[PDB]
């Protein structure tokens, strides 16, 4: 639980500083091991972004389905009449 003294921001990165401003963090794993997973963890985050894009595509397909659902919706509005 040390103090970064802007140095923490200098190495960890300015943008992250938000949550860790608003230490006592794990260092049990080997830094070489941590560097390797962070390559892979960053890859996993990229995969998650790709998945979010896929979910948006799924939402667009759902919207096409909703436009066919639209004729049924017009019939329903007529029924509510």
């Amino acid at each position: 639980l040390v103090v970064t003294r802007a140095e923490w921001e200098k190495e960890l990165g300015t943008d992250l500083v938000k949550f860790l401003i608003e230490i006592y963090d794990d260092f049990s794993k080997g830094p070489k091991e941590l560097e390797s997973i962070n390559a892979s963890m960053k890859s996993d985050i990229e995969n998650v972004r790709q998945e979010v894009s896929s979910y948006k595509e799924k939402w667009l397909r759902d919207a096409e389905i909703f436009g066919k659902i639209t004729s049924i919706f017009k019939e329903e509005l007529l029924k509510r009449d």
């Binding site: 759902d62 909703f66 659902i69 049924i72 919706f73 329903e76 029924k79």
Partner: peptide
């Protein structure tokens, strides 16, 4: 016949859910 009427009612409920679904899509 009662089961057929209930199926019609379920279809009306699905149409109702249809409006909520359109709202969610918006």
């Amino acid at each position: 016949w009662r089961k057929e009427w209930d199926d019609i009612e379920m279809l009306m409920f699905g149409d109702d859910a249809h409006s909520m679904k359109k709202m969610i899509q918006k």
